Amino acid sequence: EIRGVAFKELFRFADGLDYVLMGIGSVGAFVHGCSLPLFLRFFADLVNSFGSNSNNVEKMMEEVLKYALYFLVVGAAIWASSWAEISCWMWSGERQTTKMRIKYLEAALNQDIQFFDTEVRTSDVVFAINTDAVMVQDAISEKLGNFIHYMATFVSGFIVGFTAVWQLALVTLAVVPLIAVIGGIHTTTLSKLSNKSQESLSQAGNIVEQTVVQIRVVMAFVGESRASQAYSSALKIAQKLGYKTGLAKGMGLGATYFVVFCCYALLLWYGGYLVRHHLTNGGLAIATMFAVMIGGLALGQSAPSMAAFAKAKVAAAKIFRIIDHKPTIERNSESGVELDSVTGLVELKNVDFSYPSRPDVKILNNFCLSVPAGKTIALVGSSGSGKSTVVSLIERFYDPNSGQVLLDGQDLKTLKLRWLRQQIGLVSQEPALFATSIKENILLGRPDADQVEIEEAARVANAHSFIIKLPDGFDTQVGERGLQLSGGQKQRIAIARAMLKNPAILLLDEATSALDSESEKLVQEALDRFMIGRTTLIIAHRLSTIRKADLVAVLQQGSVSEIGTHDELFSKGENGKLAFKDQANSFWRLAKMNSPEWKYALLGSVGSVICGSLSAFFAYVLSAVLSVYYNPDHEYMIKQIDKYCYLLIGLSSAALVFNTLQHSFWDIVGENLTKRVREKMLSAVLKNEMAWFDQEENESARIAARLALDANNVRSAIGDRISVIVQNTALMLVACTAGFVLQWRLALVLVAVFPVVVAATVLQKMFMTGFSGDLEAAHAKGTQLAGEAIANVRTVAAFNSEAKIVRLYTANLEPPLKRCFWKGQIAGSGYGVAQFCLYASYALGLWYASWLVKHGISDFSKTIRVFMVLMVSANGAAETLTLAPDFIKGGQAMRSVFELLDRKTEIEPDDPDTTPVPDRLRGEVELKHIDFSYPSRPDIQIFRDLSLRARAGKTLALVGPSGCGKSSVISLIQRFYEPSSGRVMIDGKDIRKYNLKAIRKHIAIVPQEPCLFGTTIYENIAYGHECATEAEIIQAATLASAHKFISALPEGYKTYVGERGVQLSGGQKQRIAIARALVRKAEIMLLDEATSALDAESERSVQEALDQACSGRTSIVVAHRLSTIRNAHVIAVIDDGKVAEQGSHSHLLKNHPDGIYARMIQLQR
């Protein structure tokens, strides 16, 4: 396969406007990248002129004013360059990708069906839209501009550093690889540990998934405690892994800080050494160190652009592979012929289109069909693939295999696709309603129709019926809340679309089987009763569709063995603003929940504070050193520099230790809180109603994802941001007090421009993250429309709707293009304004410091210290501000957690106070006056005053009709559900006022669906009893005859079983389930359908096991088997929920057995 395409080939769809936009964006990116080292050079010059002219205040003032004006110029240039790069790059990328998406969809729809059958799957073609949006759109829009900007930053920083002071720049260049290596090691270790932790969390989520999808048996066998214990053990494993991750992260940050501080101490000492020997000044030294570091960071940030370039190269190679392919059918004569005035007597004398995915096997053998002109024909046979193949051959899907197919004596090779498709009124299995308005779907047959023609076409489907009462009539769309059901109007919509097309030769297909007779009867009256009936083949439900048809044309082995009259029968055997007060209260409650860990957090908090202070100290030291750089006394400079270097090394050691401490303790408390919350949520979920589990929102996958997502958000957001906000608040406080006590005038002035600085820095962080949001979410409508069109390429090609589909695609993609353009313009303008205001604030601060020094109010050293410390504090505040959205997300996640946890249950399985349980039960049960609503579908009500009797020690074999009630009765006696007015009357007492756990301790359940747990069958049998020994398991296996096959298995009781397991036979796993029921050893055992699909030996063995199990004491069995139910005291058949005669199998009186218990016995024998 192709491993990529040339990078320049990614710009295939770029026009002159795209080229000029890319040029402007490149220039803007280059200037914006080069600006920052230029600002560093200007800052160095300003500091040199401000510190070297203490004797002459005048010249100092003019130089400071000049360099403040230079700062303003740099800010304006940054504004212009950032605006240009962001807007131009974003818009050009969007334009190119939209053009390529349109071309890709057009090419895909222009391909043949065999292309999707053999070369590329349809799912891959649909996924290509999203993979394009993710890689190709993103690399050429933002990643390329970022790459240019970071290359410019790196080159300009290196040039500035090596032109200012080449020796110190060389030393910093040697330093940079140390930080790079430390960061790389930290990232690799953290990624590996996080991968392991994610695997452990996935195992825990799998445990939740398996215990929620199969709650029927978990609740019945009071296994919630075992599930909670297993989940707790998995969470302990994940918690140890999380502790290791936190320790590794703390160690990495500590090592980074230690290396940075030690290397900066060395660099400051060497810069001092240069200053004494008059090779430079302090400002140049600081500037060159910072510039070389900025260049290294620029390379580091530019690497991801290269990664995105590689990904987009691969994706664009795939996209161009799909686009550049040429269709095979289109290679014929584009002129063709149009015979016109079709009669409809086409003759398919031999078949073709052998599904080239499987050319060795020929699915359809050559046969003659010869549909008569103006006469209906219907053919049934094979397994539905033959009829579909005949339809495909009729719709010019020809691939030369055998003979030819002709229309009215004209072979289709001379015919044209654009005309032949117009003559075919296809109706398929799926109506294939595209995401658009109803009037567009109906008009899709031919765009040259009007409203009146659409009205007449829909008139056949009972005028409008459901359509007229729709919110917007024909203009409503199917994407939003419309009908959203297969048994809806969409089939009639497809029928109307066919009617709006030419009523020539047409290919009917089997319609829906749900809803009522109106839809199908409309199908015949619009497709068979309009005269000139065509080939209306029926794949399934041939009870009356083919009986009404005049021809049968049976299709054994892909050939017409018999054709003609329809009277003769055959061997058919088919079935037939958000609130914040409550949010803060919720944080208070959550912090109360994890109270035992406060000390941990508290200790970590202390470390956090210290860490913040350390940062401030570093800043101070730098400024202090800068001041010492501008001191005529050389020896005093030596002493001060040595003192500051030693203090910096001490700060490095302290930073390592306390960063490790802070991160480790905060992650420890976060993981403990997360585990406690997860356990609480699982305990709350398992203690709920079965009707609660029946809801779609509480589906197994949904609950698993909710548990895996909400807890992770509550962990990460809360822990990370609480640590960050504590350390940054400490940094802010110490910085503010230091700046004030040094020079409160300058400190106050800088605090005035504090919001401007924090806004500019948060915009800088957003720019580094990316100014384009979710790209796939922008084109969601277009993507889903394209996916629907491609998945139904047969329908699109049948109606010649490729042009209409691509036009709708362009119409859907234009608003995202305009929105992207405006978003890019707004983002560029805002970012540029923020940067300009930031540099204006810097210039104003320096000018005010110079003015204060000029008037004798302060000195150079105090002012420079205040400035640097305050700027560092502002940067920390900006970091907190940009981490705040994670706080918002964690708050909403924890709100969801608490709303789930505080949910109250109408039934509680563990009632603290109730009448005591008897050790031995009598077993009698009454179901007097049962009225069960079944709240899953309240529109359907069952058990019309149902009444059930079962006294001690006899098997109750009520069966009823299949598909009505059945297992629901069992669901009542476990009290999974609650009858509206029913009375459960077991053992002369009421369950609804009784403890559920005590009863479930005494009842056995074997549902018709097999139940499998874990990986070993041993615990599958053992699940019945909490403390079942080996002897009990052996005995229960012998009673159920389960020992023989499980001994035949190699691993035996420890055989790998489950969804990924051996996937053994249904009978064996049913034996396992009944063995588990015997292990429970319940005084009351309840059975279910036991004869779904088994062979003779397995059927006999499981029946013997059932007879052995029911013997001994009271049991209820339903099943569906004919007779030989052994214990046949009374057998009841439900009639739409009402109570009917409980005719026994002895046939005492022939009223009930002759009524319902007669036909099914003869049919099943």
PDB file of C-alpha atoms in Angstrom, residues 612-699:
ATOM      1  CA  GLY A 612       5.065  28.958  44.457  1.00  0.00           C
ATOM      2  CA  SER A 613       7.333  30.981  46.717  1.00  0.00           C
ATOM      3  CA  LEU A 614      10.365  29.318  45.155  1.00  0.00           C
ATOM      4  CA  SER A 615       9.321  30.546  41.719  1.00  0.00           C
ATOM      5  CA  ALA A 616       9.115  34.113  43.014  1.00  0.00           C
ATOM      6  CA  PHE A 617      12.543  33.764  44.605  1.00  0.00           C
ATOM      7  CA  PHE A 618      13.995  32.671  41.273  1.00  0.00           C
ATOM      8  CA  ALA A 619      12.565  35.763  39.602  1.00  0.00           C
ATOM      9  CA  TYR A 620      13.879  37.972  42.391  1.00  0.00           C
ATOM     10  CA  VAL A 621      17.328  36.410  42.132  1.00  0.00           C
ATOM     11  CA  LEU A 622      17.491  37.121  38.406  1.00  0.00           C
ATOM     12  CA  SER A 623      16.525  40.746  38.933  1.00  0.00           C
ATOM     13  CA  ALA A 624      18.944  41.000  41.844  1.00  0.00           C
ATOM     14  CA  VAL A 625      21.744  39.586  39.709  1.00  0.00           C
ATOM     15  CA  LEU A 626      20.841  42.047  36.959  1.00  0.00           C
ATOM     16  CA  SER A 627      21.274  44.921  39.404  1.00  0.00           C
ATOM     17  CA  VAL A 628      24.606  43.512  40.580  1.00  0.00           C
ATOM     18  CA  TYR A 629      25.634  43.510  36.923  1.00  0.00           C
ATOM     19  CA  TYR A 630      25.433  47.326  36.925  1.00  0.00           C
ATOM     20  CA  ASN A 631      27.781  47.966  39.841  1.00  0.00           C
ATOM     21  CA  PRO A 632      31.213  49.628  39.508  1.00  0.00           C
ATOM     22  CA  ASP A 633      32.554  47.837  42.604  1.00  0.00           C
ATOM     23  CA  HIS A 634      33.953  44.605  41.182  1.00  0.00           C
ATOM     24  CA  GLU A 635      34.658  42.790  44.464  1.00  0.00           C
ATOM     25  CA  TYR A 636      31.187  43.560  45.817  1.00  0.00           C
ATOM     26  CA  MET A 637      29.836  42.176  42.545  1.00  0.00           C
ATOM     27  CA  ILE A 638      31.849  38.977  43.055  1.00  0.00           C
ATOM     28  CA  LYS A 639      30.528  38.509  46.585  1.00  0.00           C
ATOM     29  CA  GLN A 640      26.917  39.203  45.613  1.00  0.00           C
ATOM     30  CA  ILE A 641      27.052  36.924  42.564  1.00  0.00           C
ATOM     31  CA  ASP A 642      28.537  34.068  44.599  1.00  0.00           C
ATOM     32  CA  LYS A 643      25.885  34.528  47.294  1.00  0.00           C
ATOM     33  CA  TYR A 644      23.080  34.527  44.727  1.00  0.00           C
ATOM     34  CA  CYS A 645      24.477  31.445  42.971  1.00  0.00           C
ATOM     35  CA  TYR A 646      24.682  29.503  46.243  1.00  0.00           C
ATOM     36  CA  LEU A 647      21.157  30.590  47.163  1.00  0.00           C
ATOM     37  CA  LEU A 648      19.982  29.526  43.695  1.00  0.00           C
ATOM     38  CA  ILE A 649      21.494  26.057  44.139  1.00  0.00           C
ATOM     39  CA  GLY A 650      19.726  25.796  47.489  1.00  0.00           C
ATOM     40  CA  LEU A 651      16.477  26.827  45.815  1.00  0.00           C
ATOM     41  CA  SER A 652      17.074  24.150  43.169  1.00  0.00           C
ATOM     42  CA  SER A 653      17.355  21.411  45.787  1.00  0.00           C
ATOM     43  CA  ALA A 654      14.314  22.747  47.647  1.00  0.00           C
ATOM     44  CA  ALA A 655      12.347  22.940  44.392  1.00  0.00           C
ATOM     45  CA  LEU A 656      13.138  19.319  43.551  1.00  0.00           C
ATOM     46  CA  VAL A 657      12.151  18.050  46.996  1.00  0.00           C
ATOM     47  CA  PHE A 658       9.004  20.126  47.417  1.00  0.00           C
ATOM     48  CA  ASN A 659       7.759  19.656  43.846  1.00  0.00           C
ATOM     49  CA  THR A 660       8.030  15.902  44.369  1.00  0.00           C
ATOM     50  CA  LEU A 661       6.229  16.231  47.711  1.00  0.00           C
ATOM     51  CA  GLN A 662       3.439  18.458  46.373  1.00  0.00           C
ATOM     52  CA  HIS A 663       2.680  16.428  43.260  1.00  0.00           C
ATOM     53  CA  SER A 664       2.888  13.082  45.067  1.00  0.00           C
ATOM     54  CA  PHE A 665       0.573  14.109  47.901  1.00  0.00           C
ATOM     55  CA  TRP A 666      -1.946  15.880  45.666  1.00  0.00           C
ATOM     56  CA  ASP A 667      -2.149  12.889  43.337  1.00  0.00           C
ATOM     57  CA  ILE A 668      -2.479  10.581  46.356  1.00  0.00           C
ATOM     58  CA  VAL A 669      -5.464  12.502  47.715  1.00  0.00           C
ATOM     59  CA  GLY A 670      -6.944  12.799  44.222  1.00  0.00           C
ATOM     60  CA  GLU A 671      -6.710   9.057  43.593  1.00  0.00           C
ATOM     61  CA  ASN A 672      -8.167   8.269  47.020  1.00  0.00           C
ATOM     62  CA  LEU A 673     -11.107  10.600  46.383  1.00  0.00           C
ATOM     63  CA  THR A 674     -11.610   9.131  42.907  1.00  0.00           C
ATOM     64  CA  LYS A 675     -11.669   5.559  44.202  1.00  0.00           C
ATOM     65  CA  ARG A 676     -14.085   6.472  46.997  1.00  0.00           C
ATOM     66  CA  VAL A 677     -16.386   8.250  44.535  1.00  0.00           C
ATOM     67  CA  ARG A 678     -16.280   5.318  42.103  1.00  0.00           C
ATOM     68  CA  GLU A 679     -17.187   2.869  44.865  1.00  0.00           C
ATOM     69  CA  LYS A 680     -20.031   5.123  46.025  1.00  0.00           C
ATOM     70  CA  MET A 681     -21.446   5.445  42.501  1.00  0.00           C
ATOM     71  CA  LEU A 682     -21.256   1.697  41.869  1.00  0.00           C
ATOM     72  CA  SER A 683     -22.972   0.981  45.190  1.00  0.00           C
ATOM     73  CA  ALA A 684     -25.711   3.476  44.313  1.00  0.00           C
ATOM     74  CA  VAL A 685     -26.188   2.013  40.820  1.00  0.00           C
ATOM     75  CA  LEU A 686     -26.414  -1.590  42.012  1.00  0.00           C
ATOM     76  CA  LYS A 687     -28.985  -0.470  44.616  1.00  0.00           C
ATOM     77  CA  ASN A 688     -31.709   0.710  42.236  1.00  0.00           C
ATOM     78  CA  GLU A 689     -34.797  -0.470  40.358  1.00  0.00           C
ATOM     79  CA  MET A 690     -34.913  -2.812  37.392  1.00  0.00           C
ATOM     80  CA  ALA A 691     -37.116  -0.271  35.606  1.00  0.00           C
ATOM     81  CA  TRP A 692     -34.299   2.215  36.190  1.00  0.00           C
ATOM     82  CA  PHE A 693     -31.939  -0.184  34.410  1.00  0.00           C
ATOM     83  CA  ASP A 694     -34.463  -0.590  31.583  1.00  0.00           C
ATOM     84  CA  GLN A 695     -34.257   3.095  30.625  1.00  0.00           C
ATOM     85  CA  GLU A 696     -32.232   3.895  27.512  1.00  0.00           C
ATOM     86  CA  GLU A 697     -30.162   6.536  29.319  1.00  0.00           C
ATOM     87  CA  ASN A 698     -29.168   3.864  31.876  1.00  0.00           C
ATOM     88  CA  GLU A 699     -27.996   1.400  29.239  1.00  0.00           C
TER      89      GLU A 699
END
